[PDB]
Amino acid sequence: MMIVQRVVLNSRPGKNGNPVAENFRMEEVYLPDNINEGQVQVRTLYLSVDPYMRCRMNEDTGTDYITPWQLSQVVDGGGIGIIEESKHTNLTKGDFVTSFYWPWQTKVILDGNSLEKVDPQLVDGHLSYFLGAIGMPGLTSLIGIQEKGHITSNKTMVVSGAAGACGSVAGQIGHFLGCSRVVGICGTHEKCILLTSELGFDAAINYKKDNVAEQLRESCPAGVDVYFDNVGGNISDTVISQMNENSHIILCGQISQYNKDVPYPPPLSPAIEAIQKERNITRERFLVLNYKDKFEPGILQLSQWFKEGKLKIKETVINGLENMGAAFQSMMTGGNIGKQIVCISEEI
Numbered sequence: 023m024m025i026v027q028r029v030v031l032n033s034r035p036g037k038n039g040n041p042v043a044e045n046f047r048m049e050e051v052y053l054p055d056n057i058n059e060g061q062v063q064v065r066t067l068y069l070s071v072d073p074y075m076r077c078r079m080n081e082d083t084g085t086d087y088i089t090p091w092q093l094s095q096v097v098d099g100g101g102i103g104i105i106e107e108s109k110h111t112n113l114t115k116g117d118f119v120t121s122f123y124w125p126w127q128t129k130v131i132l133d134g135n136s137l138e139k140v141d142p143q144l145v146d147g148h149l150s151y152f153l154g155a156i157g158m159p160g161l162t163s164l165i166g167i168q169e170k171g172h173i174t175s176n177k178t179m180v181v182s183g184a185a186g187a188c189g190s191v192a193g194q195i196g197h198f199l200g201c202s203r204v205v206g207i208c209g210t211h212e213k214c215i216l217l218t219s220e221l222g223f224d225a226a227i228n229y230k231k232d233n234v235a236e237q238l239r240e241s242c243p244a245g246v247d248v249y250f251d252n253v254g255g256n257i258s259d260t261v262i263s264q265m266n267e268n269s270h271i272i273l274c275g276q277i278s279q280y281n282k283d284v285p286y287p288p289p290l291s292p293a294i295e296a297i298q299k300e301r302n303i304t305r306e307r308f309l310v311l312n313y314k315d316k317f318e319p320g321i322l323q324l325s326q327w328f329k330e331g332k333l334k335i336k337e338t339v340i341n342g343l344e345n346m347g348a349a350f351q352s353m354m355t356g357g358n359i360g361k362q363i364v365c366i367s368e369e370i
């Protein structure tokens with residue numbers, strides 16, 4: 023048997039704690055030499071890190087559709103790989119495949135029925151895009167905007183988490199689908215420049231260093247019609263206060279709250295909820311997995327926009343399975359521009 027590397031959950035940060043690289047531990051394990059009928063042996067190429075993973079580090083995730091990671095057991099998440107051996111009738115050696123529950127391990131034996139075969143032509147061979155802009159975050163942005171944005175209209179969109187995986191795509195799609203103005207809120211001036219100089223955002227606001235309320239008044243002079251919310255907390259309170267009658271909050275995530283012992287989705291404060299109700303602002307829970315029937319058209323559209331040169335795809339790649347923990351910590355504290363990716367093998 024050959025020896026491979028895996029990542030297991032080492033320790034929990036606590037419900038109110040910050041996640042750190044040391045919450046994960048690398049181990050070496052044997053990979054069995056044979057696979058059974060219906061299984062495939064896959065070489066892991068890229069793995070995702072994602073904000074939802076924070077709740078998987080707690081003993082109770084607080085959400086009925088996410089299971090907690092278990093101490094000393096292999097971690098899992100979005101991944102893409104290449105089939106090395108197959109005893110599944112619909113998969114063969116050399117196929118590229120994806121799973122939402124890919125073990126954090128360099129080579130894996132999986133049930134073939136749990137994988138989706140993907141076409142590398144859709145990403146011009148850049149496979150890591152299947153974990154970002156031509157993957158779940160891209161789909162979340164496109165389907166979120168389509169289903170919850172009510173964009174036809176010379177509307178103004180605000181995007182929080184604007185320079186992240188979802189946000190960087192959302193702001194571009196807002197322009198593609200008819201917003202006249204798209205304004206981004208993010209955590210660094212470097213990110214602000216990216217948004218306006220490369221991604222076509224009309225304005226960018228650094229929430230750490232800028233006065234968010236007054237910058238939104240200057241950059242959104244006609245108020246806010248659509249809010250693509252990745253962050254929640256005080257930032258969302260500030261945006262909501264400038265939202266128009268009959269506007270829409272695309273409630274994508276609330277990452278400002280993930281290191282706190284509070285339920286998801288978190289309620290708005292009494293003052294901000296009052297504004298929401300008075301202005302008839304809609305704020306419905308959005309779960310991209312409720313729209314799996316739209317993933318095909320979504321991916322095909324994201325791909326087409328990419329290939330046309332319209333959709334600009336940004337990512338931050340760290341190399342090596344040993345860096346999964348560091349990549350997660352980095353993403354959670356804003357180290358990533360666009361999608362955080364970990365490259366697990368050589369790009370061939």
Ligand SMILES: NC(=O)c1ccc[n+]([C@@H]2O[C@H](COP(=O)([O-])OP(=O)(O)OC[C@H]3O[C@@H](n4cnc5c(N)ncnc54)[C@H](OP(=O)(O)O)[C@@H]3O)[C@@H](O)[C@H]2O)c1
Nearest residue numbers: 073186187188208209252274275276277278308309310356
């Ligand atoms: N509803 C769904 O089906 C669905 C699907 C996918 C993702 N989501 C949600 O979408 C959001 C974005 O996920 P992603 O994968 O695109 O991650 P991401 O935006 O690429 O990475 C997270 C970013 O969050 C920002 N951040 C971290 N802590 C913050 C804080 N306290 N306040 C403000 N910003 C903070 C950081 O950028 P800064 O430098 O700008 O702080 C960091 O780069 C998350 O809330 C996630 O749960 C939802």
Ligand SMILES: CCCCC1C(=O)N(c2ccccc2)N(c2ccccc2)C1=O
Nearest residue numbers: 072074085087158274275286309310311
């Ligand atoms: C409690 C986290 C809040 C937003 C959250 C969500 O419900 N999903 C989410 C939806 C269904 C199953 C699992 C998570 N994911 C998510 C992350 C990456 C890709 C897709 C969805 C999210 O980040």
Ligand SMILES: CCCCC1C(=O)N(c2ccccc2)N(c2ccccc2)C1=O
Nearest residue numbers: 086087088089122309310311312313314
């Ligand atoms: C997308 C890859 C497979 C994920 C699959 C799943 O595990 N959950 C899921 C997780 C736990 C319990 C039930 C389903 N749901 C799901 C569907 C809609 C909304 C939320 C989750 C899914 O679609």
Ligand SMILES: CCCCC1C(=O)N(c2ccccc2)N(c2ccccc2)C1=O
Nearest residue numbers: 120122138140152156157158317318321
């Ligand atoms: C949450 C994942 C559950 C399976 C899921 C998948 O990963 N892809 C999928 C593959 C690559 C990127 C994003 C999703 N698609 C999918 C996409 C387009 C057409 C058919 C299927 C899927 O339905």
